[PDB]
Amino acid sequence: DLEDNWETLNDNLKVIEKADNAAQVKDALTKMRAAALDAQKATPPKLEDKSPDSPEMKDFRHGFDILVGQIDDALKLANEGKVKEAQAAAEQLKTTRNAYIQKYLGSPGARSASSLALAIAITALYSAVCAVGLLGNVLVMFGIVRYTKMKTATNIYIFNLALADALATSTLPFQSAKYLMETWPFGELLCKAVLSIDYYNMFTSIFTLTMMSVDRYIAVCHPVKALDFRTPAKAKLINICIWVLASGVGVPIMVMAVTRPRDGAVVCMLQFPSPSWYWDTVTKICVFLFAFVVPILIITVCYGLMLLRLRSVRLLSGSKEKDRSLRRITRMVLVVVGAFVVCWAPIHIFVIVWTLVDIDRRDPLVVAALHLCIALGYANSSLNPVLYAFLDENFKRCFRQLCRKPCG
Ligand SMILES: Oc1ccc2c3c1O[C@H]1c4[nH]c5ccccc5c4C[C@@]4(O)[C@@H](C2)N(CC2CC2)CC[C@]314
Ligand SMILES: CCCCCCCC/C=C\CCCCCCCC(=O)OC[C@H](O)CO
Ligand SMILES: CCCCCCCC/C=C\CCCCCCCC(=O)O
């Protein structure tokens, strides 16, 4: 209510300076006056702790009284067709606004300024995530393809995470541009690509982590039975099944993703069939369930039992060297899974809150928090290759060898 009044007041001052004619000035003055009278009835957030009779609230009201009277005088000029004189009076309005109202409401366009500062912060973070995650995950993929010692079932699942992570990080410079420009300049096909990739990363990542966790559970807790379940070839086939299952959501996203005009700009968005708010809500609930709660419950059972096994048995296999290896690989999986949960839980919860709950969605701290949770979800992509290199001696060694011989 007050926020909107303050913007309209300030926006219309600008219209007046830009006006071609008296009618445009009269119209803008008329809106400024309406906005001013509404603002005058309200309490600034800063003054919530004060009496209506305090020197602060007296001052705030006095300012709008002065402003309204100046608008009344300028309207008489505009009504009589005197555009230059009307425009000149709008200059005096800035003085009043600055001396009395900005005191309490903050600088005009402070909200816009925060939006821009956030977009610049997002761009910087997204550029870092993109560089580390794209380059890092491409190396992981080439490394696994190149080396025989790298083709283990666990690492075939890691290949799947890397593919998703490479795709997602490749979108980030486009998303940055969108945030800075406050519009989508890239056309509909790229919109479909970016939205689809975004959802495929979300679904394939968690499906892959669930299968990695089950695979590791089998390896650690059922080592004899494991021979009948675990091979690199089987993990590769499960990866394909993961992408096919994820396409259940992916292909509908591909179809529904469109560019639409919205408030002078172009938005890249999902067009749900009617009633759109309903299918949006159903989809968000299903994402919360099947991309977050359900796989995390599965993983938690496997995770807890792996922890119990690791402390309840002296040796997981024949030799201390190999035991050590199985324990190290298991720890790496547990860290990767843990890092995923820490990076993605905040945004999963926040999407549900934003969609279903009556929060203040235009509040800058709430918007910044939301965007930081989104960024944290992407940052998981850049984190992973770093985790693999520090937690698995074979990744470290094969990263070095790949770089020694890029072409063999
Ligand atoms: O239902 C989802 C649950 C979690 C996420 C999303 C979901 O629908 C997308 C979506 N709609 C929103 C509506 C209001 C506020 C935020 C979002 C997001 C965030 C996000 O863009 C994000 C997360 N990306 C992934 C990105 C964090 C790395 C995947 C797609 C999407
Ligand atoms: C498939 C599993 C791996 C995928 C990895 C993600 C990469 C997505 C890349 C490009 C999407 C381009 C989409 C091409 C456009 C076809 C959809 C379409 O035409 O939309 C219908 C229209 O909007 C109303 O009916
Ligand atoms: C905005 C969309 C841009 C998407 C494309 C850029 C991201 C590229 C991602 C993955 C391609 C890398 C595949 C490397 C696997 C090794 C292939 C092989 O050697 O057989």
Ligand SMILES: CCCCCCCC/C=C\CCCCCCCC(=O)O
């Ligand atoms: C870019 C910001 C990313 C911040 C994410 C922080 C990542 C660390 C998160 C969780 C680590 C979980 C540790 C799991 C313990 C291993 C169990 C064990 O081996 O006994």
Ligand SMILES: CCCCCCCC/C=C\CCCCCCCC(=O)O
């Ligand atoms: C690693 C586990 C962390 C999980 C905690 C999740 C916290 C982020 C999720 C939701 C926060 C929602 C906050 C909404 C504040 C409402 C303010 C308002 O408008 O009144």
Ligand code: NA
């Ligand atoms: Na991912």
